Structures are given as structure tokens and as C-alpha cells.
Design a protein around this nucleic acid. Sequence first.
RNA 1: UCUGAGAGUUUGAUCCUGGCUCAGGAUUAACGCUGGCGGCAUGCCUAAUACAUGCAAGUCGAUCGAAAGUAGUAAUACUUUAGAGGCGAACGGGUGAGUAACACGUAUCCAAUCUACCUUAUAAUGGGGGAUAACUAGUUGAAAGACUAGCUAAUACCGCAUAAGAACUUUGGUUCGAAUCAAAGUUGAAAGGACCUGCAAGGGUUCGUUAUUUGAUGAGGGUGCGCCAUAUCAGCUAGUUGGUGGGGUAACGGCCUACCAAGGCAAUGACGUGUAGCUAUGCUGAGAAGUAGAAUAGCCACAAUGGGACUGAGACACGGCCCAUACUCCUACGGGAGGCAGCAGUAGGGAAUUUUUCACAAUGAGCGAAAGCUUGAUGGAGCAAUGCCGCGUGAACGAUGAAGGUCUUUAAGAUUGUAAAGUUCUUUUAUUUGGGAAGAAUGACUUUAGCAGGUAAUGGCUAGAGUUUGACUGUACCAUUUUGAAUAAGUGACGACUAACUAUGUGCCAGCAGUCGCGGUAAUACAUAGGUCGCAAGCGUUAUCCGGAUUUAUUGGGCGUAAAGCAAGCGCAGGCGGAUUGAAAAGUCUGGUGUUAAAGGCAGCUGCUUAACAGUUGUAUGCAUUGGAAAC
RNA 2: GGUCUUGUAGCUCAGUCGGUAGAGCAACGGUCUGAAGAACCGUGUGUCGGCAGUUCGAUUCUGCCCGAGACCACCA
Lengths: 67, 77, 80, 203, 393
Amino acid sequence: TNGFEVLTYIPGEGHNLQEHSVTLLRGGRVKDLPGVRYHIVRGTLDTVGVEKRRQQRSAYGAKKPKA
Amino acid sequence: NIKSNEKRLRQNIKRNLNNKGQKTKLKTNVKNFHKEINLDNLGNVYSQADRLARKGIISTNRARRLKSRNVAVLNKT
Amino acid sequence: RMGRVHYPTYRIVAVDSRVKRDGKYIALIGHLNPALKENKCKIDEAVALEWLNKGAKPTDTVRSLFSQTGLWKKFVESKK
Amino acid sequence: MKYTGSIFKRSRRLGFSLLENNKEFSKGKKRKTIPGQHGNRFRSSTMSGYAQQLQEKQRMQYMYGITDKQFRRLFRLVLKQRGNLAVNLFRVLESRLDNIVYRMGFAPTRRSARQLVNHGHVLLNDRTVDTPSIILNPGDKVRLKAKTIKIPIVKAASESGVVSPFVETNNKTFEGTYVRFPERSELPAGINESYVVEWYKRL
Amino acid sequence: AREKFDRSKPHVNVGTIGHIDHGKTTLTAAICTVLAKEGKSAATRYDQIDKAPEEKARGITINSAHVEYSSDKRHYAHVDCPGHADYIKNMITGAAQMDGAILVVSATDSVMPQTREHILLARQVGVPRMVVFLNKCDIATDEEVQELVAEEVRDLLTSYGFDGKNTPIIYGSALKALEGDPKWEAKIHDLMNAVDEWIPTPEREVDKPFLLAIEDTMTITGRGTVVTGRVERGELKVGQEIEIVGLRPIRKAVVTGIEMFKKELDSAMAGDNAGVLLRGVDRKEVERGQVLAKPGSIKPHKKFKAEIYALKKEEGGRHTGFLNGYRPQFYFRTTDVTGSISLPENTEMVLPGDNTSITVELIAPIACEKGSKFSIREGGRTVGAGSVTEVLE
RNA sequence: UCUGAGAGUUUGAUCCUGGCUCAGGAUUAACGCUGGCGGCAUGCCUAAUACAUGCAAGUCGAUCGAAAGUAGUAAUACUUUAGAGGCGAACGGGUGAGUAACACGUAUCCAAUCUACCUUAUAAUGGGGGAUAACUAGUUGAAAGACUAGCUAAUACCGCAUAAGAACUUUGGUUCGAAUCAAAGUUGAAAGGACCUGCAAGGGUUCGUUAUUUGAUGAGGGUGCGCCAUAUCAGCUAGUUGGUGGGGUAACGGCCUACCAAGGCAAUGACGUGUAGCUAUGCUGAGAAGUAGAAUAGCCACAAUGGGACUGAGACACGGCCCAUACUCCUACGGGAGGCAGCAGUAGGGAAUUUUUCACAAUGAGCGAAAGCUUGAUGGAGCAAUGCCGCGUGAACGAUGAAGGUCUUUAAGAUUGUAAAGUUCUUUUAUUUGGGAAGAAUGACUUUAGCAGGUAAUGGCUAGAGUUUGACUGUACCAUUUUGAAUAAGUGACGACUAACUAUGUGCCAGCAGUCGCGGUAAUACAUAGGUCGCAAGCGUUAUCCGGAUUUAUUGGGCGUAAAGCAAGCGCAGGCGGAUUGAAAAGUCUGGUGUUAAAGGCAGCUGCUUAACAGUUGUAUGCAUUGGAAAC
RNA sequence: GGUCUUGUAGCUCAGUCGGUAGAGCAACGGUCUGAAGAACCGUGUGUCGGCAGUUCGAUUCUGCCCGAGACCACCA
């Protein structure tokens, strides 16, 4: 929303990037990336991968697994 | 819009004009006192000022201060 | 009034109209709660005397409370 | 959670028995296998002092089958009173409505007492109860709500019901009272207040 | 507030069939001007209906709309249905909102293939005994060419199954009626008496839950989002809950207020052209041409089976057969929903006509009920025609 | 009397130092998954961005001419008011941009101050003048309106006089910068409306009148202090400093003016500069404190921007006025019109923060004899799992355990699992039925009974009789009021941290990850599945603060080899000071007094079907004053 | 709803006015190497967003549709 340009990790399985898509973000330090402490809420926007996210879709939001 | 806006706008002009006119009817007496000093003009100034000092047209405490000033400077002569 | 929602309460106060309700109270004359309409009012019974003797009409509910006590026929002689 | 659901699924893990023998026994064979097939040979995975504090929390909490919000709230309320907070709390923890109804000889289970209080079939001091979370004090009357006497379960329970030594009832009128303040010996000594009270680091 | 009406003049929906240069704008002005005298409050617009560039200047209708005009006995709403090929859907929605109408066929600018297809679709959806008016009898007042226009109008009506030999075609020209000549003003009276029969009164009912066909989407200054259309069935009032259905997840919303043409109304019932300011909705979320419903009503269906008679070229249809992977567009009174013609087994290449039982799946779930008569179009022309027989989903 | 949680991690391991991380609470919280209900409190922080509409201020005709209307042939009577006059208009509502200061307070000086109304008390409620509003006639412009000439009311406005008492002068006396008193001088007060009693004359009722006297009320100023970061911010202030005079403020004041001079501020921080509504308070803590100064409250600032003036008790006034500016709109293109930081509502923003709702029933306000009036204040209703709370989603029984998911890597048996089918049993909610409160021991209304000055009437006051105005209410609630398990469980984790294992696949690929860490070939870790576990109508994570962290240490540190003793000396200001004698008691302890509102802290109690919340009382702290001690 | 751009492989692009679907990389196998990188390469990878006409199988000549996207749709 500000003019800043920040690098982040692509969370969740799969990819639905469209080169200037809209992404709903999240923090989160990860030590495999030097100084990266940002992520995305993968699952509620134009990017919809996260196939069978059936253990935790509180993160990476998706429809409740039909039982 | 308050209902009593246009009505009071039309009304208060008379009060303003009356106050403005009555102030100078005392200012002329004060200037006459400047021109020549005597007890008669002091009495005339007090008589004309007691009208406006009664109301809010001339501040009553300010009127007291000014009348004290006038009677004090007259006592000098 | 001032109190819990759906719990009508109006504490008795000698407040001036220049001060809004829930603002600063000048002198809270005990309290009142219309949640029980048999007896729920209390006052100091001493403020009434010269807090009436020096004017400054408080909240209008003091008159009806005075009716429960008949304060006029014992105060008119002091008044004049 | 508001309920417990399965009952001996907690008796298996906690070594729990409210009937003091029959909450794990006489169902073909009293078995000590923990919930799940993973009961080969266990002594401690992370079982420790904190783990047994959690266990005792889940035991005392679920031997009344209540929620954590109510339990934390009542502990916070007891923090406002003085004296030995542990014993006063345990007496209060034993002094609400549903535990009393269970101990009057009237409820087959505290779950049944909760259901009957929910169903509006319990009357306390001429005040109909919709929530069993009242904290009772000496000098209270608990009756049967006679219009609901048609229940056979309450009939069966009331006659041969176990009456606790500190609250007393009459089945000729189906009415009872909290007579006195109980003593510790009436309750099992396996429980210790220390576990739960020192377990309190959240509040 | 926005000048609450008191609905006391009963409503009948009326429309137009044909093309511009028939005097269409002049006819729309003339009907209202004439009926204003014999009936109070018949508001008129000639260029005041026009509100946008190329509708100011060119004068054609691109975003079709309605005109209100009332009499001392009845109220009427006239739908400005267009010709102007590639605007055919804009006419379909008019025919989707339609109980009665005036077939505009002038003695000079007579029926063209566009009007042929217009009458084809009007018959195909099902219109009760449509009323016809013969226009432009002032200029080029003919004796046999007028007979020609009438005879081919009746023939075109009969080609679709109408009783064209008995369809009333009132002669005259509303241009001179608006100009001030009673000789042509009385012809509008003759037309409206011919309208009194064969153009029925819709039954405003309470038993049906609800149904709304969207005509446009509207936003007010300082108030919110208004969705307007026609209430096909169902009773309504202010404060009720309505669901958006089709092309979107079924989403619940609260109505803020019921109006008709920018001013609030008494109560919405079946067959009422109205609108509604809604609570917490977006003009983007709602779309022009969407179906509405309330919870506990008819389910939206993607795939269903019906009996469809395709459009023969002999009557103005396809000149070649259609495939199974063929992708025409269906119409449920609001939208051009696309669905492949999943013809039954052994049938993949099916020629026009030949009423046959076929099943089709749609790209969007639309509420379908049996007995509902609709059309099928693709490529700019009508390719299929039938009514729902069974719902499978 | 009063309160105390830990853990891993440097390396080969270890001891020491040490950061980091986590386990925990709180949020205008949104978001993610999911979601029955009620009580309860709050609900746009962003763009102090613009914003149709309504309403946010109207009321008084018993203050007035006059207008219109109706009952009346009239006489008139009555209703409202086009308008004048009066009252309130400055209460209130909401946004903290701004201001780092007498702003917020605190304790105080106001011998430096006023104070519409309202209280106490004293004197009367005179005679005149001039009118115009309103209106009539007309032009012009779209209106904004103005002007040309007439016509009448008031308690509208203004002379004259009486003016006790006042105020200002002169003079006299009077006590500790003030003030009372004796005399005179100057000058100043109004009003009528309705009405009883009257043949009338008049007396008078009642609202008010003026000069008055008492108050309080509020306002304002000032003092000592306290509360940001900041000297890689040392000179700054020319009305600034002091003095004289004058002008202006409710009061005094370089507040200002002209003159005479050069002083004033600051190294113990003038000021430079970034940010800021302050406080009570809310979270954490055992504490001081850190946190934010949510929501409300006290106070203060402003009202599109910048000035300015009227009136009024006070305003330059959110919704009054002029000008200029910017926007917007209308336009006859010449000129006019508007200020939701008033409520809701919309557009832009954000991830988002309730309805363009009902009643003025109740509180409260004023305007009014009264009637009655409005009241985006207020009470409500509705939206949001916004937060907490209450509460269901069935009870018991049911066996070596139905099928079946899995396993032991199959055939047992176990787990799921009393889980199940099933025996009945049932309803807070749900569902039909009728009843049903209180809130209105409000206020006035009318008569009745009684009291008082006053009598010849009244009027004023007190008790009872009735009418009442209920928004919510159909509320809460209940009688098998009819039926009914029916109306309802997800979420995350299971390697150690920090409670929660098996199978498959996968092979440092996918990805999980605060830590170590897992998958380059049998992953406790990753993806999924079964089982287990934990919180639950919510669960988790996000982001901020706090705890843990006693980890800049008053509580609560060291300066040898982990940061830290200056390279040393001289040494100003300054800090720290031998013993004995005396004084005061400044500081200090301490008792009493006033204040630090209230809410909120605490304890009891009460309504809260139980708690949330609200109310009852008591309930500290700091400052000032006063009585004690010399221990220091 | 229309004024118009656009969807060619797994991705990006080339493809006489109808004769024909391919490059670069993602990426499978060989050469490969003590093992690993590097490595030269052969693939597979499409009726061209989906449908209706025309004829010489139509991206190719057009039209229609689905979706995204530069204008107009209370709107003085």
C-alpha cells in the first residue's frame, strides 16, 4: 500500500502468479532466507493453489474439507 | 439553520445603529471637555454617560474609570 | 439518566445545565434508581437548606422528593 | 468446550473413576489400554510435573464436566476473597448447584443434572434455574419441580440415592438443603490442591 | 425522502417491436402526450428519456429503459425495445419483462429481417395475442401498399403460429396525433381499446416467495446502491432479506427501500416494475441482467433436460445443423448463459427443427422451473427453442 | 500486614559472560477456518477527504398591533400567526489538525477580577415625545432583494422629573497597600400582560418591572511544581528589559502607545529541532515503573481556509454575519447561493470498524401562567461471534466390543469403543397457546380536605379521589400452552522445546520452519490419511505493548583475561565531609485540618435466573496549613 | 449492454492473402563424470481461448460466445 518494494517468500504449495497479481500478506521470519520476514495469505485472492490443504487452512485459507 | 437566525439578523441592526449613534453623542461631550474645562461640562458628560453606562453600550466599570480620570484631571485645575 | 442499559437508573445530583449529563457533578445528593419503585432514593437532607436558600435551581426531581417530605411548610418561615 | 462427549475416553488416559471403581470396570474386562492403539509400553513421553498438572486439571475439570471459561472466572473471583484460597475454592468448587444435585442422591450423573437444570426441572428457593453455576451458601432450599416428577430416572435415583454427609434431603418431600460446611476427609485424598493452584501461571 | 407515491392506478407492462425511423421516439412521446389528457399523470419523454452521448446525438437506444404513463383507469410502463442488430439481447430482456406491446410497423419503414426475428422471439417466448399498430399513414397514405404492409404483418404473425388473420392492426400515425390532429389522436384510442383485450392484467400475488429480473443497476447520491428491474412474482416490503443467485455465490442482503423509477413505492408484488436500494451491496457485485431469489425457494440449476425445437431456416433459423460441442447461449429472462448442446446418444449433428428431448449443462447455475418457455441463440441468430422438462440438479 | 515460574542456545564437551528466541497476558483489532442463542459494553484510527436529504433551536399570542380562518345576522368568541418584542441563543454534539505551554492538573494569589437568570433584603411600579415594523402601492433581477412614497402596536426606542439606597467628586474622622463612617456636590428608576374584588372611586391577585443587597454560579488571570526526545541544538530577546506618562480589559498588567535609557533570558540548558490534545485512566509487574494516553470522563482548542465586526451575560460562534481565498452548485452568464469535526448515509482510503431506524414513554433542557412545543442530547430498536459472559448442540442404560478406518505390516485380537444399533426418557432453546408485570410512589389537570400572612374576594402551599402520556412490550416470565433429539462443532497441534503416534508417498524436489532442525534415498519434523491431544461458539495467526528480561540495575550490575578505569597529573563549579557545645527546625518523622471531582483501585452488601456491569458505604496517595523532635 | 485490444505448447513468441504448428527455457533419456558440476544434444511438449458459416482440414475470411482489459450505463 506504501511505495515500498519488498521481497517475500511464496508460501503454500503450487503457484498461481500472474505478474502483478494482488496478494494478501503475512509476516514471518524464515531462517532459510536471509532477513526475509514476510509471507502471503495464499488461498483468499486471485492466486488459488494450496491443493488438499487439509491439515491447517486457518493459514492458507480454503474451503473446509468435505468429510 | 437555526430558526432565530434571519429574524435576529434583521433585528440586531437597530440595536447596533442605536449603540453607534449614542456612543458619539457622548464622544462629542468628551471632546468639548477637551476643548474647555469647567464643572458644567463635567456634569453634562456624566449625565450623558449614565445612559450608556447603565446598559452594555459603554462598559460600566470602564465608565467608572473614565469618569474618575476626568474628575481627577479636573481637580488638578 | 445514568445507569446500565435496560436498567433505568438516575442518581440524584445537583447539577447545572451548563454541564452536560455524565460530565462533572457539583454535588451528588445521594442516589436514585427507578429499578424499584417503592423506596430507592437517598439524600444528605442538609444540602437542601442553603442549596435552596442561594437559588441555583437543581434538577427538577428534587421538588417531587420534597413532596414526599413536605419541605415547604417547614421552610417558608425561614425563607421569609 | 461445553460438554465432555465420550466419558471413559478420559477415564482411560487419566486413570479416572468417579464411582471410584466402576468408571473403568465391568465391561467385559477392566482394561488399562490408553486411548488409541499406541499402548505398547509407555511410562513417560513428556509426562512430568507440568504434564501431571495438566492431567489433574483435566481430571477435576471433567469430573464435573465444566468449561475452562467458568473455571478461570471462578478462580479469579476467589482471588477477591481471603483465607486459604485452595480449600475455600474446593468447597465452592463442590458448592454449586449441579454437584449438590448429584450428591443429593438425585442425579445418576452430573451430566444428567446439567440436562435437568437445562430442562428447567430444578427449583431453588422458589427461583427457576436456567444455569447451574450458582455458588450456594448455608440456608438454601432445593426442591424437585413436582410437575416433572413423571421422569422414571429421577424416581429411581431419589429412593436409593447417595446423600453426601454435608447436604441433607428428604425423599418424602423430595426437598433438601446445604446444611453445613464440609470437611476434606469426605473427598478423596488422591487429589491435591497444590497441583492446580501452582499450575496457575496464566493468571 | 424521495416523494413517496400512492400506487392507485393498476399496472400493465407494454412494449414496442420494430425499429427506429418508424418514428419510434415520436410514438413514445405521442402515446404519453395523448393519454395525458384522457388520463392524469402520463409523463412524457421524447429526448428526455435520452441521457447519454450517442443517445443525445444519434438518438438510438443502447441501454434500453422504461417510460411511465398513467390513465384514470390504468397505469402503463412502455419498454423501449431496440432493433439495431447486435442489440437483440436488449430486446429479449424487454420481451422477458413483457405482458403486452404495440408492434411498430410503419407504412414506409415496414418489416425488415430484424423485425422478423423480433416477432419470432416474441412468439417463441410466448406472448398472449400481441396487439399491432400500423404507423406512418400520414405520409404516403396508400390504398394497396398499406394493404401490403398489413398483409405481410399478418403473414409474419401466422408464420410463427399467431392468428394473424385476426390480429388487430390499427392504422394511422402518431406523428399527427402528437402534432394535434384528432383524426390520428383517436387512432391511439382505437389502439388502446384493442389493447384492453388480449393484453392481460398481471396478477399481483402474495403466495409466491419472490422473483426479480434486473434491468439496470443504480446508485444514489448519499444513499447507496439501487438495483432495479421487474418483480415477476412474490410479495416484498422494506427490510426483508433477499439473496443474489447465479454467476455468484448465493449471497444474503437486506433491502433498504422499494421504489419505482427513483421514487419509493407502497409495496412490491408480482408483475411490478420496481427497484430497491439495498444494504451493504456493491454496484459491481450486482450486474445488469441477473436473477434474484430469497432463501427457501427454487434452486439454481446448471444442467437439465428439456424438449427443444430448433429454428428452421424456413421460418428464420439456422441454415445448417448444430454439433454436440456446439456452444450456443441460453436465456433465462436476464442473461445469455452459454451451454453446450449435449445432444442424446447417437445424435451429434442435428439439423434445425426436429423437436427432440436433449440435455444441456450451463456454465452458471440458473434457477429453472418446469413449464418455463425460453429461447436459444448464438452467432447473432436464434438457433434453438424449447421449454424445461426435467431438472437433474 | 505484603508479594516472585521457566526454558533452550556459542563448543569437541565443559565453566563463565552474553545476546537472541520461546512458553504468557492485552488490542476501535482485521484477516484465515468455522459459527445456535441471550445478557452485557464498545463500535471508522486511514483522507481533521468532499459530502442530496431530513433532523441536530426552538419557544412564548395570558408581550404586542395586525393578518387569515371558523361558530355567531351581528356583537364578538375562539384557533394559529405574516411580523415585531422577549427568552435561550455561548447549552449541547463531534473531531484532537494544531499547540512542548501556566495546556493538563496540583496546591494557591486574586489588596486585581466580574458574574444574564436564579437567593436574601430595601425602595416603587410617573408623565410625555417620536415611531416604524406589519402593511399598502411599484420597479427591477431567476432569486439573492433593494430602493420611491404613505400608514398604524407593544413591556420596541428615547427626553423630563422625582430619585431612599447606590456610584462618582469635595471635606472630615477612622484601622492596618486596602477599608468603614459623617456632610454636601455631580449623575443615574421602571412596565406593562391577564385578572379578582369592586355601581363606580379605588384596593388588590398574579408574572414581571427598576435602583438595589445578599449569595452562589461560572469565567478569567497569575504563582510553585509535574509531565516529551533532543547541546552532531551557545548564544538569544530591540517592546525584548527597566523607568515615566497616556490609551485599552470584568479586574491589574509594554496588553498597547510615545519618550528616557540597556537591560532580560540560558551551560544547574535561552533556545534550535522532531513529535504531541494533557490528565483520570487501560494492559503487564510483587513494586516503583514500562505501555497506550482505546471507551468514557475533567478541562482545553477549532469549526472549509484567514482575518474582521454586530448583538448579547458572555460568540466573532459546527448548523449567526461581512470581506478575501479555494471548492461546489445555480444562473437570465451579468450575479447569487453551501459549509454533517450534528446523527445516521454515500463516494475515496484502509483489511475493515453499526441504520439514510422508533419514541421524546423515561432523564434532561429551555420556551412558556398554563396548555403545549421541539429536542441526531437522551432512552431505545437493529448490524458486527467487536469483547466478555451465560447457554445448547441430548440423559441414563446399552458387551468382551455390531459393521467398519487402522494396526499388529493378513489370517488372532486390539483401537476407534459405550463408540454403535437399540430400551425408553426428555425440552432452557426451538414450536403452537393464553396471560402478564413494573418502569408513570414522575409531572402537571380538575375539583375535595386543611394551612398562612389578607380580606370583602382571591390567588400561594400541603394531603387524599380519578384520568393519564410505555418507546421498549408481543419485554422478562409462566401454566404438559401443541409438538419435538429434534434447532446447532469446529479449530489447531502431536520431535525437543511447550501435553498430544502410526501408515503411505516423497527423496534437501516439493515444502514446513521462533530455535535446533526435517526431505541429495526407509522424514517422529514434510504432504495426506487414521488414531491421539488441546481450546471451543469460537480456534488459530497477524501487528503493537508488557511480562518473562533483575537484560542501562531505587527495588535490580560491573569496569584484570567476555563491552566497561580514562595515559597521568594539576585541579574550578560541584558531590562527598573529623569530634564535642548551643540555637532554630528548613529538610525528615509525626497528629489534626482543607483539597487531590467522580468513575475507576480495594472490602462488604445489592440488582444483576450466576457473573460481566452498575449502585451502597467506608476506602488511600501527593500538596498546603497547624501541634509536637532534634535522631540526623 | 454496446465502441475496441487480447487468450498460439507447460510459459513466453514465429508462422504468404486458406497448401505448414515450430525456436528459447520448464522438463524426460543418452554423451557424462573417481563421485559431482559443466556438457553436446534427441524427444514428448499444439486443429492456435471455445463455437457458427465459406471452401482447399479456417488463428489465417468473417461472425458469435466465455474471461481479462483502455470508454459510456441515478449521475445536473
